[model samples]
Target chain A: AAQRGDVIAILQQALETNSFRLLFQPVISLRGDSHENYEVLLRLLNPQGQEVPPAEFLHAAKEAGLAEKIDRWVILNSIKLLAEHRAKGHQTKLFVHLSSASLQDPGLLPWLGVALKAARLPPESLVFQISEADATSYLKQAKQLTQGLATLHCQAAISQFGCSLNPFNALKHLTVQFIKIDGSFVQDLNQVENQEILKGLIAELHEQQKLSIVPFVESASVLATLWQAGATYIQGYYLQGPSQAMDYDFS
Target chain B: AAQRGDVIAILQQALETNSFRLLFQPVISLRGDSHENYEVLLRLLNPQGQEVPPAEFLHAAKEAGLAEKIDRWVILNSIKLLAEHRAKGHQTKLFVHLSSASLQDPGLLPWLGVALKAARLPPESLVFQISEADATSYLKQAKQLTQGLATLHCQAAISQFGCSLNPFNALKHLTVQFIKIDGSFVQDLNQVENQEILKGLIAELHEQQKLSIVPFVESASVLATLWQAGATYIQGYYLQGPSQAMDYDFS
Candidate 1:
């Protein structure tokens, strides 16, 4: 794992040595759909084998201008893992995140096209998730990339959505398969108004034909409320922590 | 003075070599008293003394973890200059801006206290300004800092205000004397709705007992509108571009 100081160097070394572990958390569907879904998460493996959260190194990675490269690393490894899982007779879609830096990378889509072609995995097996802040910052780029992903037969998602002032404005420009409203909305569910807020957001996304993936479903209490609100999928530590394998039963 | 690469080193060099220039743009009171008021702006001076706008180095400065240092430099210089100017018998007030990075700095207020005492400038002679985004990002710290400034008898202002959802929520925690609305409001005043937007923001600030400073007052039409809306002070290139001297015709 990386320490606070020299984080840029630590991340660079980890990336070069493939000294990071990939974790998969289940994203269970609420509508009785059978396709298994998981989000690919990255964890830097320390020399002592401790897992270091991205939160510790991500800012440094970004400051080092390594965000795009790190995004590619995650994408490639995730594709390899997803393909192997699919070959084992399990249909799984892996959602991998792209950083704001990657959103601005004009060459990213072309590079991803090549990587996907090499893996020979169905593009539908991969869902590129971008945070709403990233999408808002690089609206034009995200719009082009999401549309371009469609041409590549790939699916896309805007994660951490509904947090911006006019989040729907970004959605209007990009064609995506999933809309993961920021988890804060769920935490704020303690507030009566927040439930209505989340309901309104989910309702609007469904009306637009985009599936809503509400995360931070930390308890069974919230599970009923989420189902009532028509959330297509829900995920959180309550379902499972990031694991080395995707063994969650969708059935 | 600073290149994209070696940003930290370059900033260190600039700070040590005093390779940055400070410029002041007048902020004139609309409703009466004769006091010299200016907003201090920073410009990185190249070897040839050409100005490098903060737009080029500010983000980099923050990335390099030197924003607090840079902020301190500006504040110290502004205080020294204002104190010297006031010694010459002019009633002067200088507004100095801080970065979001600085708002989170725990040591800033303590250092500011020492800096003020050493400069011997009246607390009210220097107004500390924080952007709305910065204050919103570090709300708790900002609230504390604003309160600390009040304790030190210094004034505080929230610049680029009113863009956030629930902007007033942050104001409720801090004791800010001035509210500078985002310049975009005045720039877009050509639109009928924008005038109402500006007026509404000013009206809200006035109700809060906060003085409103409208920037980007480019034309006579907008000037008339700001005056009509009871803006406390107005500032922009129309009054004067930021300069080495605090010379604007307020009479």
Candidate 2:
């Protein structure tokens, strides 16, 4: 009997009660870097303690105009968890997502700076990742948001990158430090043609001086191609899936 | 006041009365091939004899679930026009669009074959163009449709190409012969970086043996880059905008 309205109500209650969960997936450096990095992922739990599928709840949140609010909740909670994780004497950085609504939120940058300052965390420790579609849809806003983040010393990344009509056009105006190639290119790496596509994209990202992160790397067979492509960072189920703890040994 | 309902009504009347108009834009070959090609573009005329902006009517058509009907209308009319044009001793070919709805239509292929035979038009003279987004969204359907087209001797093209995460992945499944690079790449050719991106994409398309079409060439300046990039065909307002006649002198 659960409906879209029920999902919206659950999302509302989750936000009000801070009932959502955050999962972390390690982003390992192929270049042998020592810094620990993980991307923060979100999840929603219903009253029955069942995990609500992200596609279901996220669409409901967007439809209910709660996307910006949800993004803020994720950001705040991610900072808190990241601060705690780093307090254990492990140098850690978190890649957090910014929904389209949050990307267009004019007040997000200054508020983010204040939150980082209050948490006593370095801005560089947080990399806000925006999807290629969102960045392409709101290039001007994305430019301003990334520029503001740059001014605040926070790193910016474009996830799901290289999917747009001209994916690199967004890079022309935004100050993005990392470019995460869309997983589709990696998902079909079994095809030699797709491997070439992945390599070409990574090479282009390198030419732009943007660090390339290839995600959805589900097997070791793709690692040789990623290495040949000169991917700077890689993440997915092969190394580690999203978990409640940041226990990936980068060393 | 003209509302969405009013637009839907107009589209319904247009389809029943065969009142829609088709426009033609030349797709000029850069390789100096004598074969003449034009992409068939659709237009809607209101009762007042004014043109309805495509974005408005097309959205309404899709919303009213009339997209497949509209596509059939365009295809049938394009075949008629090409038949007459070819009768005049002008060896002409037409590129017609297939909506996402029609792409998934199980009966479209056989219906198309019947239509072509009725008009006595060679299937090779009609290249069906599918958008990269639609093809990516319905890869299986696209594969079946293009494969069906191939079986019927009709050529297939993927327009707005090089935009999907792995645009070439769609090619591996679909039997696409022409790839019209997304207009974004051509629109931003002033930037040297975008030029490199275009060049790289065209080079890759060549490797795949897919003839590359660079569209939206609003000025002559971009032609140099398109030529340098080894574009097989070029289209846009610079050469000729959509017109009522297939009168572009390719000679």
Candidate 3:
């Protein structure tokens, strides 16, 4: 464990040296859709080659004013990787996360447009995800960002959704194609009550025509319930944990 | 709307001059229990006589390193007021919130013991609450703080519960008597699904022998469901909003 100052320095050096690694986690469709979807996750390779998750360095990075840069690096690298992956005749969509700093960064949309064009990647093949907390805290920024994203023809998703005081209110403010239910709902599917809550949330999302993604799926027991509940997408260790390559066989 | 720097300055001056106001919101028992309970809320009186809510200034205060001081001021003043209120032959308990800063403050418990004893108030008459996010982030600190609170005979509670990845896991680390379900669950009880989620959360809290306090309870229409859900306590505008006086008749 590194100190906050040490973590900040490490992050800055990692950015300068291109030491960040990207992992892909497959988001399996519950409806048997043939579309290939995988979320691009970022990992920082510490000095010893050990990986540091975003949770470890993200806050410090934000404090050090490196969050937006880190997000851009992830987005650009993800686009480059996805371009190569899709060139193999697969219609793969990579879901990349945007930090709160990036949400408020006004120049992000224009930069993203250029990046997408340079890579010759279709906007529809990328879904930019924002956490519910960040979206709620910066509602106006999120609204503008998502609208800009729509104008650019890129998909927007709200992950860790439905935990806010009025989670659905956010949907009214932003144009999101996917609503990823908070992991808390999926953490305890063994409880009949939890299962019912998950079912109802997914049902509500479907009624609104927003694709619902239930994450943290760790067992086969939850799949039947998810399918029965009409979950549009499922992601977790059971399907596949995040890995270095987009190697999940959707077939 | 004040600037962040101005808000921080106002908070500092308010702290230095003892100008912050404490508002009391009654927490009514749904089980017909004859007990006086209220949550103590803080308000910052701006220059225009306009009161600023915690959401507006607490973050700034935290960043400015005034959160722990503000929490102390609230606690000390609440204790002084509660002592005077109880002198009128009414048993009342004040639920005071601890900022994340206070949770990690090593001197808070000892100082609180001195303050409570100086006022000659019963420790049990005060229930200190920490938000789920704070408790989760500082689990060890919260555990030690709550355990220390128990040693002081003060009750401990966790507010905004059930939104985390594993909401129950925090309880495993700390000894808490009350679990206030996140307001999101109570925001849409008109929806049958929301009602079930609320009922189930309350039921789960009960199974653990933890008293459940469901906040943001507006409208009489939801009362029947809350009563049926076995909710031990509830606080909201429907019961009564925070006010200058603790005058709610619980008989």
Candidate 4:
């Protein structure tokens, strides 16, 4: 019965006070893909300086028409942080989350272009992570946004992929370089049926030359199963959750 | 300059009086496909029973926020006429265009579901089409609506495709069976480079197993050129402009 106002106000203020945090979750490669990769997740700092999980404010921010602002803040900050992170003796690529609202903004790419140029970073080093659902919802804009990023030589990934009616259909339109399979598929990997499905899906992606990132790899058994299935990369609580910095030991 | 009064009144009256007519342009299949296919176009009947070009009132209708109403009316009438025409022993499918407004309408699919059910029509007998731009603007809803049509056994298509930043990306989330490539590709087919572009686009569509429809075929040379590209279907002024009746010689 309590309103989200308890957290929503904090989110609005967090944006104004420059009090948001971004955590980097490592996406480690099984095939020894040397490019350091991490998916960026956003957090809001409350008045008390306590971190607020995005799950609590993301939907609210988007509904309150602050999604575009929130997305820009994350993208600009991520680009800045990634530039710093890569300068530290690692050729790292940070996968930043883009909101569906920002996908339709005509000004977004131009703004991002300026940000990337100002940061003086290779656009390829910052891959945008758009969910299959968000991509589907904003198919045309998402298509343009991804292609626009491609013009700048930036890469794209459809995170939470493989949940659509025909997931490959999305890939056919966007210049997506990475595809993170939905974690739900990995949760049921104990079943041979689920394993076969995941393997076939990964094979299809690889056949298309799309790098597949399987998340929810929570155990040694699933990790082994995914590596054998030819998954390009895997991420989950088993390896690491999101962290304050790019501290994942990939060696 | 366009006038709002006449156009707005016409659109409103057309919705109320069923004063709109449907024109079907034949979509010919160069391959061994024997199914009769037509793309439906709408016209507004004036006071003198003169057919007004949609361009005159379509913009008005959309600007006036009657776009959803007009789209539903056209779709409902197209289905009604299609049912009657088919009852005369013709096995045919009609491709009905849905407005971007309709794509975002929450009531559109539910209304369509009931209409299709009442007509006792096979879902495959009608292919709902959304433009490349419309699908891009309302990508999420378009994905769900197209996929929802699949649940009702109805087919979906994307018209004016290949114009977006990544036209094929929209197909990933949508369970569309047909894709009408944008006619712009056909206009510049005289150049070998352009021809190669069209061929490659169609080849990619075929590789994905998505049916490709090429529109705006104006000359035999272009049509002949397209046949070899393995386009599943082709439509243009060459075949026929839209007609008031189902008069195309199918045999």
Candidate 5:
């Protein structure tokens, strides 16, 4: 839908307004009466508070080298709100995501540090969620950046963690604090074999002392399965739909 | 080594005594406790049963249709042993490996079933370990065959499952029961970030109800890391050297 240089022109306007608005669906702990732990997310708003679908703009940003910029905007904005939430007495952990591309860009991490400092937000209060795909090209660099993230006390949760990779021993060094099994896996958990697989993975997660998140869990059947399977975090359209981070139901 | 009719001679001689011998290594729990499972790998041991290295014969097998033949032999022998093992006190899982070439072959599943049935073993007790590199080619058939195996109460395992495939979800559809992460990943878990990645993958395996076998564990560090990361089975050299089924020391 390019109208002349309209896309870039519109993007510039987006940059100026810093109008990305973040809506969060609470990532509830599947344990203990469904307490909120972190958020497995889908982003709707842009820096200009315009509804920018990650699916729509994410690839464009990735190709344009603006993924870092977009990530910067999300982190800066989301964390500023997160800091505000903490001040208002929200005690649960909050996880926000950065794509694999953004995590590997040398520009993203330093800029993130600067953004967090500007927001007067402690990075520890804002964990970064990354995908396991980052392993393909970004392992070494990502590890360095992850160590830095850890040093800042920002817990890193792997979004789509075990999705592309399995066999627990290979990734024993990646040091992620939490894992979100790809939503598709959780969706089919009730199928006899799938059910066994989910249960086995959840048990493994507990054994490894990492938390498990089951995302896009829509039906009550899947949610109950995940809960019984030891999923610690749950997020999906079936849950309360995304609300503005400003309107996030911290309670 | 395929000089002038050498392959034919080798094939003919191999068929005479059912020339392939088997080296059975317990797919020990990656936690380093004990052999929770065992994978029967084919070896062309001499009359002495002094093991023939996989490197030597496997190369020969890959060049000729020997790989396919070897796979059949492995299935036949593995199932026989599995039956015998069941007859005795051991009631554990047994994994038999099939080479990439053989798994890619169309007739593999039927032949494998015949062998398993001939051994009078419960199909479920025997699992086939195939290379991930080969998994893509015959995956649909492989999936169907695995379903068949599952129907027969057998299992399918993806071996040499190094981190090459990013989506571990690629395997979500298959009736795969075990994943042996490539040894390359196992040898390198000293870094924290790597270990976390492994832990996440292990968690995914559990979620999928697939077992985790971290292969090529050659060192104590790897052994410890595998166990710590929650792998269900550990393969390779660190725990014990390879041995013939008759000579296998379970202690």
Candidate 6:
């Protein structure tokens, strides 16, 4: 979390003004491979090209009960940009996200899905996700609404997946297809027990022929370790960072 | 001759108005030899960091017959920089240049010999270059003055010795101790004649313990040619350019 900025005023401003901008980072294909499914992470940018701290704002937005609004903003902007890039024949996919508050916004689902349809993007273009903060509270409604989103013939998943103590119920018996394991555990993989746990967890997930993605990998040394442990995919600062602005700089 | 102001006017402006700047090009060793003798190419920053082209100014000056004055300015500034760098215990020789007009200027010889004394720089630390021009009219004066300059424990040599009708003089004269081939020939060394001529020249130059340098090589192929020629030293864009401002975009 950033040390600056206040939350209540931020939500008030979000409702009142449009200030957020994102700097995108590319998820490059394995060397010599094609870029059919590059993932894009959202970074809040100032007028200058640097990131705003997510911890301060995301927490502030959550505290203000504007999580749904934040999540919706992320989706609309990401997909709008995605469609524009796609039209230019860019090879990429949208790994978008939702918030727990938006999981069953009751009024948000059909209206949002209708908005998505109006964009005329392939439904599968989105890999929808959610946060995992103390995750037990949103499960029943999450399962119901996620399955609802899935029936729309698209990809849906959870974010920060292991923040819940009861992660198994929060994930299993549901059709959620992606596991973005907590960054802490992903980063901590070198620790003995953490490595063993990750190995066991990946094996169990592989039995179901599922995918396991780890985020925030920091070093090439650690990446080599993770690749050997069977990571299906990965994303983090080491591989790329919000670099599209440089395309403008170079071109 | 230059098409611009005379050397006195230019040097007066350079000293009176401080219209001088140094652009550093790294002199990396060709055969992986790391030495501090990275040749210093002089430049003038216009009103800003925007550079005035050598053709616009230097050539115009030469066409205007101010080449001798400009050569003095370059030599003065370069010797000052070398003195300053050496005062800081950095032992890097500066490769200063002499225009055809300057080489023929009897006034420059004694003054430079004095400046060499003032800086306490040895003949080994100074390399004065002469461009290849059709006028062998200055050859006798070039040899006499250079020999006189050499008697003061200084160094002088033939420079830009490309396609010269003077190789007979260049090879035979004991006054000129080094030969720097013109950049044009180095850049297109793949021509059968280029390789054959350069190697033959280099071999002849080495037999006399006289050094040889080829400048303005711009490609890996040109480097291979130099290697095949058994070049002991070389400089070009691949080694470095006229300015450090070009790390990103050098042609």
Give the Cα-based TM-score of candidate 6 against the true structure. 0.44
Q: What is the lDDT of residue B53 in candidate 2?
A: 46
Minimum summed lDDT over a 10-residue window in model 4 chain B is located at B1-10
In order of lDDT, best first, we have: 2, 3, 1, 4, 5, 6
DockQ each candidate and list the results. 0.02, 0.02, 0.02, 0.01, 0.01, 0.01
Candidate 4 residue lDDT tens string, B1-251: 11112555656777778777767778888763698898887766655544443443564464356778888887888778878877779888998888777888788888887887787886579888888877887889988898788888888998878877777787788788888887566643555787788899999998888888987554455568789878988875446545667777867
Candidate number that wins on DockQ, 1 or 4? 1
Candidate 5 ranges beyond 4 A from true positions: A1-8, A32-53, A107-109, A119-123, A165-170, A246-251, B1-251
Predicted candidate 1 versus true structure: per-residue lDDT over A1-251, tens digit per residue = 11112445557788889887787778889973679998987867545544333443564455346778899999988888877889899988988898877888889989988988998997578889998877887889999999998988888999888878788888889979899977556653545686788889899988998999987554455667788878999875445546677877777
- Report the C-alpha lDDT of model 5 over A158-248, residue by residue, as the tens digit: 7666655453643466667777776445532435787788888878988888878776554355467668777877765345445544344
Q: Write the per-residue lDDT of candidate 2 for residues B193-250, one digit (tens) a residue.
A: 8778988999999998889998755435556668998898987554665667887888
Computed on C-alpha atoms, the DockQ of candidate 6 is 0.01
Query: Which candidate wins on lDDT?
Result: 2
Report how large a share of the reference interface contacts model 4 reproduces.
0.00
Docking class of 1: incorrect
lDDT of 4 at A7: 50
> iRMS of each prediction in angstroms?
20.9, 22.6, 23.0, 27.9, 26.7, 30.2
Candidate 6 C-alpha lDDT tens digits along A113-192: 78778888775677776665423466677777777768776676556666455676666756666676765455334457
Task: List the candidates' TM-scores in order.
Answer: 0.54, 0.53, 0.54, 0.50, 0.47, 0.44
> In candidate 1, what are the lDDT values of residues B148-210, reduced to their tens digit?
888899889899888787889988888899889875565434456767877888888888989
TM-score of chain A of each: 0.94, 0.95, 0.95, 0.94, 0.83, 0.81
Encode model 4's per-residue lDDT on A82-187: one tens digit a residue: 7787887788888888877788799988888888888899757888888998899789898899889998879898988987889999788898999988755664
In angstroms, how far off is A169's CA in candidate 1? 1.5
